Design a protein around this ligand. Sequence first.
Ligand code: HEM
Ligand SMILES: O=N[O-]
Ligand SMILES: O=N[O-]
Ligand SMILES: O=N[O-]
Ligand SMILES: O=N[O-]
Ligand SMILES: O=N[O-]
Ligand SMILES: O=N[O-]
Ligand SMILES: O=N[O-]
Length: 153
Amino acid sequence: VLSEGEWQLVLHVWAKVEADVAGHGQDILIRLFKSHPETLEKFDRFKHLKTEAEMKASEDLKKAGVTVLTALGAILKKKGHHEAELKPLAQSHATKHKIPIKYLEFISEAIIHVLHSRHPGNFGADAQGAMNKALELFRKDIAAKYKELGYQG
Ligand code: HEM
Ligand SMILES: O=N[O-]
Ligand SMILES: O=N[O-]
Ligand SMILES: O=N[O-]
Ligand SMILES: O=N[O-]
Ligand SMILES: O=N[O-]
Ligand SMILES: O=N[O-]
Ligand SMILES: O=N[O-]
């Protein structure tokens, strides 16, 4: 359970993300795909992209990134009261996309990497720790839902 102060660190850096969600989503998904190429294979629509340049020019990839961060933002803004939001997301990611928890770990790592790079004004050690705690809570609650749904994750 996060403190209100931890949530405010999370939401203060999230506010900067929201200045340009598309740009942040491109940097985050590209970092994920570069750092863990096997994750790109889950995306039928742009799994053929070969290079970072191709990835940056992909309007579909950009839209995916917006979709991810907007859904994650809505979850973060619930400050742990995210049961309703997590239901559909868990279901799709368990049953349709087949995203293992290990891959949610990799995207959390990519998020933290990009925020650290872009937002040193709002992402010092305390803020990074709060964001890690928020992402760990997300993964914990998603993992519990996966088990309910029948997916070993
Ligand atoms: C913070 C973590 C994540 C969030 C909040 C998120 C959110 C979303 C949302 C909102 C959608 C659209 C609706 C849906 O299908 O549920 C989506 C689609 C998808 N997500 Fe995620 N996602 C996350 C992580 C991942 C990861 C790590 C992968 C793969 C390694 C993944 C693979 C997919 C795929 C394959 C689709 C379908 C995209 C398409 O139609 O081309 N997601 N995700
Ligand atoms: O009270 N701030 O963790
Ligand atoms: O895309 N960052 O390595
Ligand atoms: O496509 N924005 O959630
Ligand atoms: O706690 N949300 O499943
Ligand atoms: O409650 N969403 O399946
Ligand atoms: O649960 N929808 O893919
Ligand atoms: O993308 N992780 O450093």
